Write a protein that binds this ligand. Sequence first.
Ligand SMILES: CCCCCCCCCCCCO[C@@H]1O[C@H](CO)[C@@H](O[C@H]2O[C@H](CO)[C@@H](O)[C@H](O)[C@H]2O)[C@H](O)[C@H]1O
Ligand SMILES: Nc1ccnc(=O)[nH]1
Ligand code: NA
Length: 401
Amino acid sequence: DNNYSQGPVPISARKGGLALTFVMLGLTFFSASMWTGGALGTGLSFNDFFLAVLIGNLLLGIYTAFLGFIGSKTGLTTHLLARYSFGIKGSWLPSFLLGGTQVGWFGVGVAMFAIPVGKATGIDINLLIAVSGILMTITVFFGISALTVLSIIAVPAIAILGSYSVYLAIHDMGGLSTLMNVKPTQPLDFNLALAMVVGSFISAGTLTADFVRFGRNPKVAVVVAIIAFFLGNTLMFVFGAAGAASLGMADISDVMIAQGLLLPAIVVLGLNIWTTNDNALYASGLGFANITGLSSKKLSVINGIVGTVCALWLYNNFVGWLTFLSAAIPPVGGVIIADYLMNKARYNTFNIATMQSVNWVALLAVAIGIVAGHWLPGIVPVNAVLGGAISYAVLNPILNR
Ligand SMILES: CCCCCCCCCCCCO[C@@H]1O[C@H](CO)[C@@H](O[C@H]2O[C@H](CO)[C@@H](O)[C@H](O)[C@H]2O)[C@H](O)[C@H]1O
Ligand SMILES: Nc1ccnc(=O)[nH]1
Ligand code: NA
């Protein structure tokens, strides 16, 4: 397997911070973060917005730097990392939930491209799905190299064309002064808002090691996560709020259409989805490879076929389902981190032989974290991450050995 799905990335295949910075910005530069940014924008004061977006994405940035640090220290995908805490076969459970929801998001994302475009152009929505997902599936066959190519192309155009569009929109609106006078008629609960920020990428963010395992230097992995999730996801949130405030449209590609920038709009839509969806498919192949021992390349292509032929169905009904399953993903992150923090020395080698088949305490910890998210007050994802990590740190030394 060229994606090294079954063991540590060897020294000659490692990559530098530049490629991994763009790959990860390619993940967060995504329309759904713009949409959520418009919700936060219309439901919060100008100060509350930047406080919620900055606090939330910094929490995201710290959570993902840990995972990226561990991914890079070891050269292991999230799924191989999970073998330490969940067991060799126990990890199939996180791997399927993480991988499956990403196949979900991929199909969703194919529809997010083909639907606006076929409406704007009259072209058959079905035909566009076929062509979009097929193109996106072919590129994932070529692995971390393809993700590097797409995002070093996509990310500059999105940041720069998108930023210019934000500038126009605040200018034509009366400038910053007008923007900071807009008032929500029904302000959003601040803690709900934090959950929406963190919740925009905690699922893909829990698979950070699948990409930054390629980094030679663990400290650089921390920089990648912060640049991508603190700075990058914030920028996407600002795009969405600016578009909501100036025009009632939270996707910057709707703003550009409003401004007569039709070609920038379609290009920015296609580039932001293609990068996020390729990451999704890539990580899902790694995840299903941990389960089946098959080539992650082959599985990624299979995942893209299924995701394409089911795109609309996933866009419609299965989004509430995709959000539901995903509630088990944050605790899985806290367990992995906590197990590394507790048992660093264990991670010195990738040694199948000292590993468990299944650690029931890991599964028990995930359930507890889910309960902590559903009951405890505060920020649901943070409570759900800390639920799994704290209860694992308590019960694993006791009930495992
Ligand atoms: C040849 C040119 C073709 C280019 C056509 C492509 C441009 C289309 C851009 C995306 C298509 C529509 O995108 C649409 O944006 C609105 C923003 O109000 C999103 O709405 C979103 O923002 C609101 C707040 O505004 C949030 O409460 C919520 O998270 C979400 O529903 C819609 O969920 C999405 O359907
Ligand atoms: N593929 C994804 C899109 C949006 N958010 C995620 O967490 N993952
Ligand atoms: Na993207």
